[PDB]
């Protein structure tokens, strides 16, 4: 019981989603200069080590172990919908001559 309510890995919060927006003309910066930084350069920042201590040397012949078996992970139900336009709307169309106002006609007169 407590074995799995301890072993099981459950997220403690939702993933954080961020939107960054910038003007299209502001992209394509020529100053972007990707450069090499080897592990010897990153020795003070990335290249760490855990030296094997010999005096304590507490390594033991552990013999019992359990492994999380999944095989095929639990199958997921998937709902998919393929739709085009929203339902069509009818229309009324009738031919009718168009004419300028008699006020405009008299103006031209």
């Amino acid at each position: 019981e407590v074995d799995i309510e301890e072993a099981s890995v459950r997220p403690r919060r939702d993933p954080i989603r961020l939107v960054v927006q910038r003007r299209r003309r502001e992209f394509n910066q020529p100053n972007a200069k990707l450069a090499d930084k080897d592990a010897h350069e990153l020795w003070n920042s990335s290249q760490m080590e855990c030296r094997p201590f010999k005096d304590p040397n507490f390594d033991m012949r552990r013999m019992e172990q359990d492994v999380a078996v999944q095989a095929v992970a639990p199958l997921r139900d998937a709902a998919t919908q393929s739709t085009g336009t929203v339902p069509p709307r009818p229309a009324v169309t009738q031919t009718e001559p168009l004419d300028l106002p008699p006020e405009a006609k008299q103006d031209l007169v």
Partner: protein, 120 residues
């Protein structure tokens, strides 16, 4: 220099970070560097540095434009220590991608990981 009008924000599918290709690169580096190698604490750090440098160089040779490459190599002695390695990121998943591989012999075990984050 390319103007913002024709500057494609998304990489071409031929230039996209190929997870399988990076798997192959990392596996080739691990095989070339650690196959038959016994654990040596004084040599392990240098071996990890060389593996990371080789993987980064091969990723650069892949010539995927605007793809920053981050390579991390863990090599540890196989004394039977319980190891739990995990990662968690926060980026744009549309263009950024990841790959990793593992090697293990009778003395040492190594995990080499390469992340390609797209530049805009």
């Amino acid at each position: 220099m390319a103007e913002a009008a024709d500057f494609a924000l998304e990489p071409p599918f031929a230039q996209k970070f190929k997870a399988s290709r990076v798997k192959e690169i990392i596996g080739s580096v691990l095989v070339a560097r650690l196959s038959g190698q016994q654990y040596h604490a004084d040599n392990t750090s240098s071996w990890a540095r060389e593996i990371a440098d080789e993987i980064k160089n091969k990723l650069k040779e892949e010539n995927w434009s605007r793809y920053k490459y981050v390579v991390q190599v863990f090599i540890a002695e196989q004394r039977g220590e319980g190891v739990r390695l995990a990662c968690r990121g926060f980026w744009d998943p549309n263009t950024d991608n990841y790959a990793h591989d593992t090697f293990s012999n009778e003395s040492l075990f190594c995990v080499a990981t390469a992340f390609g984050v797209y530049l805009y």
